Design a binder for this molecule. Structure first.
Ligand SMILES: O=c1[nH]cnc2c1c(-c1ccccc1)cn2-c1ccc(Br)cc1
Ligand SMILES: O=c1[nH]cnc2c1c(-c1ccccc1)cn2-c1ccc(Br)cc1
Ligand SMILES: O=P(O)(O)OC[C@H]1O[C@](O)(CO)[C@@H](O)[C@@H]1O
Ligand SMILES: O=P(O)(O)OC[C@H]1O[C@](O)(CO)[C@@H](O)[C@@H]1O
Lengths: 439, 439
């Protein structure tokens, strides 16, 4: 009579499943279609969106047709391979697109993937009609993301930042690679049919990203995930900036080996806070936003900076529930079953009346969205919160996330470059205890 | 040396403020400009957006030029008042717009308002240039929301739903009011200059809502609040649906007068769950989404429905921190200072290591966004969570929110109609304790 049991790891109430003598086991995936001329940031969008979607828990994978081409055709010689009159290479390129779609079908229908990002030019109505046919026959949704930018400064910058360094241009110098790539773009210009939501593409679910996100044309958003993608694309930018991530200075609970709580900075923690102020000053940043949690130790650290700061409840350390203010030895002795369950499944494990790393991701999502909108930001937080944010920026999986090394009195300087983050570590030469525990 | 104190009500760590002998006390507001012909849902957008922004904690107010006109000109006779050749009424209408802007300045610069929604036609470039001049001179941001829809079915439906019932048409029958309103729309058509983000309005921050949210043109989103508005407008719809809100059936903690915890349904709670299934069945809904919290009592209630349901951690009852599983008598005797602080400031009060109603709003925001996207939804939740959701739908203030009456074994049936919600209460004839406590 409505009998439930609480699952040991995640602490989820499930109906008591008294399976009979013979136990029996018993929404639609999306193909995101990238659209646009080369050097329009399609791969940049594909990679960043995939990184965000995976981090929030939506299994996402990129299928880049160019990588299938590099695999089918050993070495790249020139733009001549991309010529519309190149009958043989046109057959090869089509075969590569079809092979990528085959892997899209396998990913979405057989591997538990939810979103497949089809990263190609898809510049002709013919190619897009074929992708739609493929989606309709496989019961997949189709969502188009077109990037429109004809600014020559933006095109040249994209070639210099990520095209000249491509495996295709290994034997080329910067000038030859740039010249070949401009000719390669020209191969696509004649047959390019932009998305037309006014007449031809009126019934398609699409986003037209115009001039690096200055303007957007949004047509027929069908569901939750498409709506989320659109909101994300509207919040991200390519302006140069730095993200500094650190934990509060060493606290009294750190000295006692106690988890959670709301203890204050130790004498060393206060020394780090002074060292952090000097470090921040030496960075010579025009403007800098400072974010803390609502816990004392991060606020005391920010107080040493003499800069305005904003407290976020979303940045508060993982809630250990009944295990709050206990040492790991006291957890193992009072709750041995709980201790072993966490060690076996650190990401999904939920503390009783507490949280999991999975819960942390959900509450840090608005932090991530705001970090994307901002420029120079310093986030003073906690060990588990920091691992979660770092996993987003460094594209780390749910499995590796609870084990990322985030020592005390150490600043993680993140510089967005090419298709990810350059990470520099800066230890501020103040002693502390070690709170890192390996698997 | 980084000395902080925790504020008694909100539990916020603040620098110990040792004010000297003579204590001294010491971002830009936004004008949202509605654009479009009459019967385009501008007032609908204004009211709904204001309701959402206020609920999330952004002080927002609507300034409807027509209400200033109804105040300046006692009785409305006909569309002749709106004629472009009506020199006198054109002077009166301009004076009303200027008087509304005067009140916009006072609201944003002197009353602590953050967003002013300027609800008028603002169909000419001249009027919009004047509003921009007003915004620039007062250091206010300007964000334009244009609603474009020329579907005669949509226009006729808007006139029938909310125009014919306007105080202007009190002495008129449905046919005369509809005829007069069509003529009134025609008065605006000749001088109407839609927003042109391509050439003329390229530097303006705007959203063009096309065909009741089927399509959007988004130009130059400057900040966080504009980005949030755009996301909200993309999630809302006018499709007919019903929202059912109720608490879990009576639990064991309810019988003991204990707060929080994760107790199961009492015998009466199980009887409500059966009664709820019968009620749901009798509603004869084609499709229905069922949402619960992750707490046992709501899941057991949903289990009785024999329908698929989704558990949301965001729907979990307010966290009472150290006061969890205690009766109110035990709270008053163990924590008398805490008890009195809560009674004095129920919305902002945060339980030690727990939450406030203010915290609840922040974590329920994704619930609200998803409720907007959906159609028929049944939310099985908890007393404080329910008050928070109800305050959103019923446009209740932060001050009234902790005192809204949400009894056990009672379904709140919400039907979106005109500019809000019709609320029907359905008691399912199962006895329970009373958990309501007045101020
Ligand atoms: O080249 C480009 N053209 C046009 N839009 C571009 C790029 C790049 C880019 C940035 C770094 C390297 C290579 C490419 C990113 N976006 C972009 C697109 C949409 C959004 Br919303 C944000 C950024
Ligand atoms: O008449 C209309 N024309 C055009 N758009 C309209 C309406 C109404 C409406 C609904 C009920 C009563 C009166 C008006 C709402 N929206 C609307 C606008 C934008 C979004 Br995003 C969602 C709904
Ligand atoms: O997930 P882990 O490795 O236990 O680390 C999280 C813990 O780290 C701390 O931030 C410091 O020990 C605790 O407050 C928190 O419980
Ligand atoms: O804000 P109030 O009036 O104390 O009501 C919230 C309380 O109501 C309950 O849902 C039932 O008593 C408790 O779990 C919760 O603490």
């Amino acid at each position: 009579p409505l009998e439930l049991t609480q699952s040991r790891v995640q602490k989820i109430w499930v109906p008591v499943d008294h399976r009979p003598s013979l136990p029996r086991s018993c929404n639609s995936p999306t193909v995101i279609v990238m659209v646009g001329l080369p050097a329009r940031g399609k791969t940049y969008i594909s990679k960043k969106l995939t990184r965000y979607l995976n981090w929030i828990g939506v299994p996402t994978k990129v299928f880049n047709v160019g990588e299938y081409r590099r695999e089918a055709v050993k070495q790249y010689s020139s733009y001549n391979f991309f010529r519309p009159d190149n009958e043989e290479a046109m057959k090869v390129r089509k075969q590569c697109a079809l092979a990528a779609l085959r892997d899209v079908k396998s990913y979405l229908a057989k591997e538990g993937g939810q979103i497949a990002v089809f990263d190609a030019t898809n510049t002709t109505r013919e190619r897009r009609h074929m992708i739609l046919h493929f989606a309709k026959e496989n019961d997949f949704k189709a969502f188009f993301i077109e990037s429109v930018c004809d600014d020559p400064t933006v095109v040249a910058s994209n070639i210099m930042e990520v095209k000249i360094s491509s495996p295709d241009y290994k034997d080329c110098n910067s000038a030859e690679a740039m010249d070949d790539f401009m000719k390669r773009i020209s191969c696509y210009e004649a047959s390019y049919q932009p998305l037309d939501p006014d007449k031809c593409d009126r019934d398609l679910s699409l986003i037209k990203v115009i001039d690096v996100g200055r303007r957007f044309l949004v047509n027929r958003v069908q569901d939750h995930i498409q709506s989320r993608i659109v909101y994300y694309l509207m919040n991200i930018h390519v302006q140069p900036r730095t993200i500094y991530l650190c934990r509060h200075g060493e606290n009294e609970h750190n000295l006692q080996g106690r988890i959670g709580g709301d203890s204050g900075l130790s004498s060393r923690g206060k020394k780090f806070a002074s060292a952090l102020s000097k470090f921040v000053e030496e960075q010579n940043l025009k403007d800098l936003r400072v974010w803390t949690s609502q816990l004392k130790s991060t606020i005391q650290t920010a107080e040493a900076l003499r800069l305005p700061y904003e407290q976020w409840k979303a940045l508060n350390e993982i809630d250990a529930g009944v295990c709050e203010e206990l040492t790991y030895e006291e957890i193992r002795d009072t709750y041995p079953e709980e201790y072993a369950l966490r060690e076996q499944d650190k990401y999904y494990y939920r503390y009783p009346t507490g949280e999991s790393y999975q819960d942390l991701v959900q509450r840090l999502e608005p932090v991530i969205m705001e970090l994307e909108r901002q420029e120079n930001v310093l986030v003073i937080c906690h060990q588990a919160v920091l691992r979660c944010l770092l996993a987003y920026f460094l594209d780390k999986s749910a499995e590796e996330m609870p084990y990322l090394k985030c020592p005390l009195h150490t600043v993680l300087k993140l510089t967005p470059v090419a298709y990810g983050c350059r990470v520099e570590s800066i230890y501020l030469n103040v002693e502390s205890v070690c709170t890192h525990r390996e698997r």
